[PDB]
Design a protein around this ligand. Structure first.
Ligand SMILES: COc1cc(-c2cncc(-c3ccc(C4CCN(C)CC4)cc3)c2C)cc(OC)c1OC
Ligand SMILES: COc1cc(-c2cncc(-c3ccc(C4CCN(C)CC4)cc3)c2C)cc(OC)c1OC
Ligand SMILES: COc1cc(-c2cncc(-c3ccc(C4CCN(C)CC4)cc3)c2C)cc(OC)c1OC
Length: 283
């Protein structure tokens, strides 16, 4: 039989040190093609090894289609092919969109749902998985108003994470590296920062905050490991909760939830399943 493998690359939608992401076409359908730099080959290998272990299928996880390795004259070409989400990343979306109560809750609950699915061991099933680089650029917006989590290149089953989103135990190197729950608790910290990013863009009483990344007011762009350690570990700063949130019951509840993702003590932080339950009881 015929195995049609040609993908037409149509538009570059992302370029970085990782490599590039392209909108592509296969058999008349959009796909996303991540082309890896040689410097980030281990991210392709880790995502490929994970999907060869467990074929994750979840509405809030970016959908896997293929991993391809192709021999070139003097190099190896590595592609990861996934579902394509034309609305782009949550980071992108929040710059130029504000949210209402329903659309804010739907976004954050969908992220919590994807994260809880990664974290949970299922017997019969899937290993527990920690993401290790959760951030708004690694979350895509779907047309139905839910999101999905992307990029399992650092994931661990039971490159470093983006420094702006690193938990205090990563920055002060006290993380218990042989306890898998440690890695879940690092993801919860990052989730809380994403929850703060999104909540800022929810309108209440005619007020909204501008899009800003976590810690925009206390560290430079491309903050160093030391910059972050001083803020998060030494001074123990946390993102600001504006006064206007305390006039809105949804933002009041989201502020409480953020607080419980940001405890210095990793074992005090909420679990993804508890976050889901709390979000389902808001509004
Ligand atoms: C190798 O490379 C690529 C292949 C494809 C692709 C194209 N047509 C058909 C297929 C196909 C799927 C599944 C079966 C099954 C049928 C039932 N039988 C009992 C076992 C085998 C056969 C064929 C594939 C996998 C797409 C690609 O990219 C989108 C590929 O490149 C990454
Ligand atoms: C990689 O991705 C895509 C693949 C395909 C595709 C192409 N040929 C054949 C298949 C297939 C047929 C049949 C089985 C069998 C397996 C065992 N048993 C006997 C029942 C079912 C499995 C696989 C598929 C899935 C289509 C896609 O989209 C429409 C893909 O997505 C981009
Ligand atoms: C985070 O990581 C990965 C993401 C993706 C991915 C999947 N769907 C869609 C996208 C995308 C599409 C379009 C825009 C723009 C272009 C049009 N307009 C001007 C604004 C919107 C941005 C982004 C991406 C980047 C795939 C990946 O791998 C194949 C990723 O890596 C794991």
């Amino acid at each position: 039989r015929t195995v049609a493998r040609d993908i037409t690359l149509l538009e570059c939608v992302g370029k970085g040190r990782y490599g590039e992401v392209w909108r592509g076409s296969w058999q008349g359908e959009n796909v996303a093609v991540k082309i890896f730099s040689s410097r980030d080959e281990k991210s392709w290998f880790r995502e490929t090894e994970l999907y060869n272990t467990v074929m994750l299928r979840h509405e809030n996880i970016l959908g896997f289609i293929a991993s391809d390795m192709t021999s070139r004259h003097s190099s190896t070409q590595l592609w990861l092919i996934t579902h394509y989400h034309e609305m782009g990343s949550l980071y992108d979306y929040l710059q130029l969109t504000t949210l209402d109560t329903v659309s804010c809750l739907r976004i954050v609950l969908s992220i919590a749902s994807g994260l809880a699915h990664l974290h949970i061991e299922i017997f019969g099933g899937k290993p527990a998985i920690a993401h290790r680089d959760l951030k708004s650029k690694n979350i895509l917006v779907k047309k139905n108003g839910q999101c999905c989590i992307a990029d399992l290149g650092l994931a661990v089953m039971h490159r470093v994470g983006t420094k702006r989103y690193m938990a205090p135990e990563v920055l002060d190197e006290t993380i218990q590296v042989d306890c898998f729950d440690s890695y879940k608790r690092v993801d919860i910290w990052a989730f809380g920062l994403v929850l703060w990013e999104v909540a800022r863009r929810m309108v209440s009483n005619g007020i909204v905050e501008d899009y800003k990344p976590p810690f925009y007011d206390v560290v430079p762009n491309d903050p160093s490991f030391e910059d972050m350690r001083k803020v998060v570990c030494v001074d123990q700063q946390r993102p600001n909760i504006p006064n206007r949130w305390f006039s809105d019951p949804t933002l009041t509840s989201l502020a409480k939830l953020m607080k419980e993702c940001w405890y210095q003590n990793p074992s005090a932080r909420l679990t993804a399943l508890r976050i889901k339950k709390t979000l389902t009881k808001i509004d």
